[PDB]
Design a protein around this motif. Sequence first.
Motif, PDB file in Angstrom:
ATOM      1  N   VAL A 166       0.855  -1.183   0.000  1.00  0.00           N
ATOM      2  CA  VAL A 166       0.000   0.000   0.000  1.00  0.00           C
ATOM      3  C   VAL A 166       0.894   1.237   0.000  1.00  0.00           C
ATOM      4  O   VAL A 166       2.085   1.116   0.229  1.00  0.00           O
ATOM      5  N   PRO A 167       0.375   2.456  -0.275  1.00  0.00           N
ATOM      6  CA  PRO A 167       1.154   3.679  -0.067  1.00  0.00           C
ATOM      7  C   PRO A 167       1.260   3.900   1.435  1.00  0.00           C
ATOM      8  O   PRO A 167       0.371   3.504   2.193  1.00  0.00           O
ATOM      9  N   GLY A 168       2.361   4.520   1.854  1.00  0.00           N
ATOM     10  CA  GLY A 168       2.557   4.833   3.259  1.00  0.00           C
ATOM     11  C   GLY A 168       1.357   5.593   3.821  1.00  0.00           C
ATOM     12  O   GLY A 168       0.983   6.637   3.291  1.00  0.00           O
ATOM     13  N   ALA A 197       0.621  15.479   0.482  1.00  0.00           N
ATOM     14  CA  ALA A 197      -0.227  14.577   1.255  1.00  0.00           C
ATOM     15  C   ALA A 197      -1.667  14.580   0.741  1.00  0.00           C
ATOM     16  O   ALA A 197      -2.210  15.609   0.281  1.00  0.00           O
ATOM     17  N   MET A 198      -2.293  13.405   0.859  1.00  0.00           N
ATOM     18  CA  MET A 198      -3.622  13.150   0.319  1.00  0.00           C
ATOM     19  C   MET A 198      -4.520  12.537   1.383  1.00  0.00           C
ATOM     20  O   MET A 198      -4.166  11.568   2.034  1.00  0.00           O
ATOM     21  N   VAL A 199      -5.707  13.137   1.520  1.00  0.00           N
ATOM     22  CA  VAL A 199      -6.713  12.755   2.505  1.00  0.00           C
ATOM     23  C   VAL A 199      -7.943  12.207   1.792  1.00  0.00           C
ATOM     24  O   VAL A 199      -8.598  12.986   1.102  1.00  0.00           O
ATOM     25  N   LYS A 200      -8.287  10.921   2.029  1.00  0.00           N
ATOM     26  CA  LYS A 200      -9.322  10.252   1.258  1.00  0.00           C
ATOM     27  C   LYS A 200     -10.518   9.940   2.145  1.00  0.00           C
ATOM     28  O   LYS A 200     -10.363   9.141   3.054  1.00  0.00           O
ATOM     29  N   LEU A 201     -11.651  10.610   1.881  1.00  0.00           N
ATOM     30  CA  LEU A 201     -12.837  10.494   2.700  1.00  0.00           C
ATOM     31  C   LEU A 201     -13.312   9.042   2.706  1.00  0.00           C
ATOM     32  O   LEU A 201     -13.494   8.416   1.654  1.00  0.00           O
ATOM     33  N   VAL A 251      -5.384   8.967   5.741  1.00  0.00           N
ATOM     34  CA  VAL A 251      -4.269   9.750   5.209  1.00  0.00           C
ATOM     35  C   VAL A 251      -3.174   8.901   4.546  1.00  0.00           C
ATOM     36  O   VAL A 251      -2.660   7.949   5.113  1.00  0.00           O
ATOM     37  N   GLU A 252      -2.950   9.214   3.267  1.00  0.00           N
ATOM     38  CA  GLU A 252      -2.023   8.515   2.400  1.00  0.00           C
ATOM     39  C   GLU A 252      -1.114   9.505   1.686  1.00  0.00           C
ATOM     40  O   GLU A 252      -1.492  10.596   1.213  1.00  0.00           O
ATOM     41  N   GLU A 253       0.113   9.028   1.485  1.00  0.00           N
ATOM     42  CA  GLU A 253       1.130   9.780   0.776  1.00  0.00           C
ATOM     43  C   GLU A 253       0.855   9.770  -0.725  1.00  0.00           C
ATOM     44  O   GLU A 253       0.561   8.732  -1.323  1.00  0.00           O
ATOM     45  N   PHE A 254       1.024  10.952  -1.324  1.00  0.00           N
ATOM     46  CA  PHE A 254       0.827  11.144  -2.750  1.00  0.00           C
ATOM     47  C   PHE A 254       2.086  10.772  -3.538  1.00  0.00           C
ATOM     48  O   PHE A 254       2.960  11.611  -3.748  1.00  0.00           O
ATOM     49  N   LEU A 255       2.135   9.512  -3.991  1.00  0.00           N
ATOM     50  CA  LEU A 255       3.156   8.984  -4.889  1.00  0.00           C
ATOM     51  C   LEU A 255       3.216   9.842  -6.151  1.00  0.00           C
ATOM     52  O   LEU A 255       2.197  10.053  -6.802  1.00  0.00           O
ATOM     53  N   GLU A 256       4.410  10.340  -6.488  1.00  0.00           N
ATOM     54  CA  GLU A 256       4.527  11.437  -7.432  1.00  0.00           C
ATOM     55  C   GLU A 256       4.557  10.913  -8.865  1.00  0.00           C
ATOM     56  O   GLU A 256       3.770  11.344  -9.708  1.00  0.00           O
ATOM     57  N   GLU A 257       5.504  10.009  -9.127  1.00  0.00           N
ATOM     58  CA  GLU A 257       5.812   9.598 -10.486  1.00  0.00           C
ATOM     59  C   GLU A 257       5.101   8.283 -10.772  1.00  0.00           C
ATOM     60  O   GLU A 257       5.564   7.223 -10.330  1.00  0.00           O
ATOM     61  N   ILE A 258       3.946   8.393 -11.456  1.00  0.00           N
ATOM     62  CA  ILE A 258       3.108   7.239 -11.772  1.00  0.00           C
ATOM     63  C   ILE A 258       3.215   6.952 -13.273  1.00  0.00           C
ATOM     64  O   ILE A 258       3.005   7.852 -14.075  1.00  0.00           O
ATOM     65  N   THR A 259       3.561   5.706 -13.639  1.00  0.00           N
ATOM     66  CA  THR A 259       3.795   5.318 -15.024  1.00  0.00           C
ATOM     67  C   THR A 259       2.585   4.566 -15.586  1.00  0.00           C
ATOM     68  O   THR A 259       2.108   4.890 -16.674  1.00  0.00           O
ATOM     69  N   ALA A 338      -0.993  -0.978  -4.135  1.00  0.00           N
ATOM     70  CA  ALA A 338      -2.443  -1.047  -4.135  1.00  0.00           C
ATOM     71  C   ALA A 338      -3.004   0.163  -3.398  1.00  0.00           C
ATOM     72  O   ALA A 338      -2.665   0.417  -2.245  1.00  0.00           O
ATOM     73  N   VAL A 339      -3.940   0.862  -4.062  1.00  0.00           N
ATOM     74  CA  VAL A 339      -4.391   2.185  -3.653  1.00  0.00           C
ATOM     75  C   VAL A 339      -5.876   2.140  -3.279  1.00  0.00           C
ATOM     76  O   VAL A 339      -6.298   2.819  -2.341  1.00  0.00           O
ATOM     77  N   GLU A 340      -6.614   1.289  -4.002  1.00  0.00           N
ATOM     78  CA  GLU A 340      -8.038   1.136  -3.821  1.00  0.00           C
ATOM     79  C   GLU A 340      -8.411  -0.345  -3.727  1.00  0.00           C
ATOM     80  O   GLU A 340      -7.887  -1.259  -4.390  1.00  0.00           O
TER      81      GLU A 340
HETATM   82  N1  ADE Z   1      -1.061   7.559  -2.765  1.00  0.00           N
HETATM   83  C1  ADE Z   1      -1.514   7.973  -3.945  1.00  0.00           C
HETATM   84  N2  ADE Z   1      -0.746   8.810  -4.683  1.00  0.00           N
HETATM   85  C2  ADE Z   1      -1.205   9.223  -5.869  1.00  0.00           C
HETATM   86  N3  ADE Z   1      -2.358   8.941  -6.462  1.00  0.00           N
HETATM   87  C3  ADE Z   1      -3.098   8.108  -5.711  1.00  0.00           C
HETATM   88  N4  ADE Z   1      -4.328   7.604  -5.994  1.00  0.00           N
HETATM   89  C4  ADE Z   1      -4.673   6.810  -4.947  1.00  0.00           C
HETATM   90  N5  ADE Z   1      -3.771   6.765  -4.000  1.00  0.00           N
HETATM   91  C5  ADE Z   1      -2.759   7.589  -4.477  1.00  0.00           C
END
Ligand code: ADE
Length: 458
Positions: A166-168, A197-201, A251-259, A338-340
């Motif tokens: 998962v993302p941190g 940083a990303m906050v997911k309801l 609360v999840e970290e926004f991974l920057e470089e997505i391919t 895995a994000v979702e």
């Molecule tokens: N951690 C994450 N970083 C970037 N995009 C995302 N979409 C879902 N989770 C994400």
Amino acid sequence: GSTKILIYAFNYADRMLEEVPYLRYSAERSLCFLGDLRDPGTRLVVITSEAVDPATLDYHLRDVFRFDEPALADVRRRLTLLTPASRAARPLDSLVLEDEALVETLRRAVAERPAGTIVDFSASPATDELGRRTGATPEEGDHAFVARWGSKSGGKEICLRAGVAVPGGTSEVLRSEAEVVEAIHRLSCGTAAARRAMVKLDAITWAASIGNVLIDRDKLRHTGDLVGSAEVIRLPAEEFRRELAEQGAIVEEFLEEITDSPSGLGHIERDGTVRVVACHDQVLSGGQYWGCRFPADERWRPEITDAVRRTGEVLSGLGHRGAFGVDFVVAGERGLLAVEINLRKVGPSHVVRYAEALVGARVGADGMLRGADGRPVYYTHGRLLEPETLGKLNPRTAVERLRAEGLLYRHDTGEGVALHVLGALNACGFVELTALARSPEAADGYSRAAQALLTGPY
Ligand SMILES: Nc1ncnc2[nH]cnc12
């Protein structure tokens, strides 16, 4: 004897139905299930907010599922198409429920047969009610469970348990802004041009990218308020706040470089049997998933499969029966995360059904579909909306165009183009197209050709 009732209502879209208009025609997706009528016993009932067009049906019968002419009459006899009396733009299941008479009819139908199954997108109050009140058990209903575990936090937890990357972040609800802030300032950072940083309801009502809200920590560290430092908020601030209060976020970290953004699709049988249905390479493309491709990239297909299987096992243990979805990101050299998690059918699912039908075979081995001859199969699937050009067509017209320029899928060659949701053509200038070839490049080309044909005059 089987009875199956198809209500592919997008219930989790309370707003989008009132915006994206081709949504009313969404249910047509369910027409991938007609394959089932191959069993002499199965009887199907289709429900759409707007009436399925005879032309479309014909296409499905002949040019999609390739019914032999002898049996076809029988097949037709075991098919019913029904529309709720409500033509207001609301989730289909709700509409169905509102029409007492329709519900009664459904119940009667169910009774008439040994067995009842309701075929749905996501499990919902309305669907559950229908199941109860008709004696059909939703194939993908289980509302409370879904609420519990399809949520962001729940999904994350499940992923963790599975041992899927998962993302941190934590898997803990944040019922206040302060909590959220704390979560944000306790993260992994990592070298990032613009560390975020990303906050997911947490709610599943907020599925996909309405809930997700993203804040650059720099702005925060200067101004204490969440919605003062929001780089992307798609919620009215007040509404967001309310959500945070009442349901909260994670609360999840926004991974920057997505391919790439691959997807994994899973089915749990009722006896706990998990099946890796398929792997694709979704392309969020503004999150409206204007489409996807199969199979997944060779590199991370195998990797994905195993992960999916693990997740499926976990879900079975938890006790979810039906279908699950795992959405992933590929994060530079950091790998695959895995994000979702989705406790519901997903876009690819319906497409996959159609693909399978076209081929004549199921997904294959454990991964990668193959034709009669054994030779691999590749498909490209896109949503295209062009009021301008498509709003001129009707299903029938489109189908004939495809036939003419030898674009339509033929079973003898084993490659071509099949449409979905044809009813949206005349009305919203919307269509799904799927293209199948011997090589993925070829498939892509075919798709392009189809697009050219349909989005031009003639
Ligand atoms: N951690 C994450 N970083 C970037 N995009 C995302 N979409 C879902 N989770 C994400």
